Amino acid sequence: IKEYRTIKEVVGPLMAVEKVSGVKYEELIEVRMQNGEIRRGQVLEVQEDKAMVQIFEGTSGICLKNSSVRFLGHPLQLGVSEDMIGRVFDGLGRPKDNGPEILPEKYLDINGEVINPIARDYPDEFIQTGISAIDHLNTLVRGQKLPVFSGSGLPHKELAAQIARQATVLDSSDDFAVVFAAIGITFEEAEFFMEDFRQTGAIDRSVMFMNLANDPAIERIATPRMALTAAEYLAYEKGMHVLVIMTDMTNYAEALREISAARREVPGRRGYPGYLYTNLATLFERAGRIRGLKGSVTQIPILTMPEDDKTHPIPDLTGYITEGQIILTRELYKSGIQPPIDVLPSLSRLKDKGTGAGKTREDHAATMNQLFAAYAQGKQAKELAVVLGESALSDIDKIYAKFAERFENEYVNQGFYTNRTITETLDLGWELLAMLPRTELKRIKDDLLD
Template sequence: MKEYQTITEISGPLVFAEVDEPVGYDEMVEIETPQGETLRGQVLESSDGLVSIQVFEGTGGIDRNASVRFLGETMKMPVTEDLLGRVLDGSGNPIDGGPEIVPDERVDIVGEAINPYSREYPEEFIQTGVSAIDGMNTLVRGQKLPIFSGSGLPHNELALQIARQASVPEEEEGDSAEQSSADHSSGDEPREDDEEGSEFAVIFGAMGITQEEANEFMQDFERTGALERSVVFMNLADDPAVERQVTPRLVLTTAEYLAFEKGYHVLVILTDITNYCEALREIGAAREEVPGRRGYPGYMYTDLAQLYERAGRIEGREGSVTQIPILTMPGDDDTHPIPDLTGYITEGQIVMDRDLNSQGIEPPVNVLPSLSRLMDDGIGEGLTREDHGDVSDQMYAAYAEGEDLRDLVNIVGREALSERDNKFLDFADRFETEFVQQGYDTNRSIEETLDLGWDLLSMLPKEALNRIDEDLIEEYYREEEAETAEVEA
């Protein structure tokens, strides 16, 4: 180890020191204060004779008499299967009162990029139990599907619901998929080890959340038993911003180990990406970098891509890493750099809507601007149900038409509309109050979601179902629903 007492400047979370030997980028550092306290840091920039160090615990207590030791290695995450059920802080240290972690190995948190040639195309369905996602914007193993939310919207409640309900339905033999769904609809926990390699795990990474939010998360995890198959990383709002940059990398390193070494299907939930990007901006300002759009660093796109692109499947490996990053759009502006850049990198988005939330819809997911680019591959033959794609397309088209007609009603009134138009208006209302609305404790199987979709589509005349195969209409169309709709009209 190289040790120096050559600190020249302290700026925010950064310490600058002179060195006489080359120091590696991302190298770990220990800083010992004159009071005997040891703080950890990481080399952020290294040039001839000068290094800048970001200090995880903050720079309080550090002065120019402090000693700087370069450890000669990058930051590593101690990984083991025993991490499941544990709660860690944003630096990977246990905070649940349990024993110290005895790792199987220590892995560099930067990770290794997945060779595109070795990537396996994502096309296997993940059931979240949320109809607006499973039915309309299906999540697929190995996908990165962010949730675009806003300040004050219940994205945390949706994240917790997905964390405790998400499962990989069996799809190998006979009616195993139906059996798995039946287990869900009866309220049973998903079967996690029916066959080798089918275990499911959730890695939950919280960045910059308040203590109150952290308590809510932990109470929910413990109440529902979801903690047993989860690893939780907690970085709080009063923790150093520098730690916020490390937390998602610790999360993803743990996920990669469980997925590619232990065969788990891992769902990674990261909240809030906006807090992470604010930390990037704070560090960039301390380094006196030339800012990019709205003051964020010009390299933010690259930085986010390094996180998001760690999702995927590897050919020949059992496991998978699926990501649901959650971000709050400042001012509900989807052109803000954070959602804008995220949309370029990821494969779609789930959009939460303030108007739906004000109407009491839970979860308030607006399916019209939402999108899952891999949905068609995840609902193919034998993966969910043969009518899934047609039902989704038809409901999307019918709801969009109903939304357009709402604008027209504000001008001319319902009495001026045709009988057909009034049916589409009624469809839009029931779609929100029956299909999207389900509460945060209801776990719907994909069969229940599609059956509910057919109930709603049967309000419309058969000739209006122009996106569904005629054979499927004959099999699933509910005549009694159509008759009820006629009577009500």
Template structure:
């Protein structure tokens, strides 16, 4: 291990130093300042004679007299099952006042790419307890399903609700228990948000089955690049070595991408779309593709990344690239939020591309797919009719159209609306769906099998009495 005092430039979060031997990409660096502090960094770029180093704790206090040591290894995460119930900072150090972590292993935070041939197709249901997700955009094990939100929308509340409610239904288990765990990685959040997260985890007891990584807004931006990788490395260890089903919630990916842009600017890179690095797609894919199932392994890694769309623009590079990589999206809606709908999930632009493989007989209920399709179609028709009402008035509509308008209102108020403390089973969610669909004429239910209609459709009591009297 060689030590250098050859710093030539300090630019933002980066330090440039001259070297006389090859240095590996991503190699860990220790920088000792004149006042005795030791800062950690990582080699970002290595060329003949000079390296650029990103410093996790920030470059404050570093001058050209500081010593630079290259440790000859990449950054590793100390992993153990005892991490469950612990709170760590964005660099993986405990901040909960608990004992030091005694690891069973130290694993590279870059992870090991899953061989596509060894991947198992995701098709097993995860119940989040949120009707708009379970009923309409079902999450399955091994999937990556992001939440697209906007500034000021309650995505944190939804994230916490999923973290404490998500479970693998017992009837869906194959053999004996793979346990369920949650990895919560927060990037660039405020101290107030961090306190809210921790209060909720502790109040509900969800912390016992969780590992929390906290990178705050006043922490160095460089640390935000490390936080999701530490979280995913922990998830992979629990899933593929300890047989847990792991749900990874990462918030906010927009802060992560802003850190990428900041570092790219410090390196004087040629910017891509809207100033973001041209390699942002590759960088995000390296994170998102760490979700999945591996053949022969009981555990799984499922991801719910959360991002706030700048200006509510879903064509912005961050949601745009995320949508290309992941298998759908859950869209939060500002209008629904202003109406007091909790959670304000708009099911029309939302999508879970793997839903069809994770529902149905033996997975949820045999009527799940038909009910979801019919509610989607009816709600979409109701939304179109709302626009028409603004032009011609409700009195100009037919009785059938008025029923679809009523359905749209009830769908938002009874199905999507449930609050952040209500945990609905998939059976409860589908029963609410049938209650709503039973207000529509039977002949309008053209996406549901007739046998299912005969079994689940609820005749209005007065209509049923009239039919009986006529008979």
């Protein structure tokens, strides 16, 4: 570790250190201030005996003449270990639960590696989230990236915590770990997850990376990378099935935009950096399975859509990298729908690989199609009249409408603390159907044994 007291200049969040040697790009630094205060930093640029670094905690209060800079000789790394399970961490990977520090097995670059295309393996099998609206018709598969699109008003934090508890692989002898990443959330929101995780005992199988809204923007960007580096360690080195949940990705993009402005870079679209897509892709591609290895990495990125716009560069690019999305609407939520998932606009591209007779009741593929069709037509009749007098609908158009209604209140409205097994989910969806006539159908001819 090198230490210089030759800090030449300070402009904004950036410092210039001269008469330096052996310094590398993206190297971590420490600023030891005259007051004895310490701040982390990163080498943005090195040029012929000079180093431009950016300070995470800012540059306010720094005295150039009486300050020193330590070059750590490495970038941002995570001290990955098995002891991380049941522990709570910084966005920088530092203990946040006042427990004993972890003696790391090794240190890994939080940027991770790029998987060889021929080394990558297609994803299965099914993952039970205990939430029916998700297991069909928007099924989650091991190694998939299935994001949730929400809004500021909506309760994604509740949905996020419910999945972390109810997530599991039935049945499997392999371990199922959960890596939870909180990005730029308030103390009370973070305290919520912490309180829920320990109340239910879900923390015993989880690794939490907690980044707060008043933490440095840099630590905000590093948070999801700290999590994924841990997830891949447990998955591909420990053979665990890891589920990574991240919120809020909207805050992540803002930190990218915030940091990009500090570095005085021209914005591509909506003020966001042109490499926002490339920066989301760097994150979202760090999921899946490896041939020959037991473990897997599944991602559930949760983000709030600014102004409820899906064409926004944040959810737009995410949609371009994630295979499907779970949509939450205010119309449902305002109607007391929990979770308020609109299964219509929602999608799961890899669902067909998770809904397997070996993995899920064969009723599922058909039942899902039937349930969708029935709800869809049900909602529509209501949607127009509505304008026309609803009254008693022409023929069974009223019947469409009415079972759509029951559909929201008992199928989707399971409750944020009710864990439905995939078998129970299938029966209920059918229970709507049994109430429908055998006459109207998209369903299987062998309505048996059930």
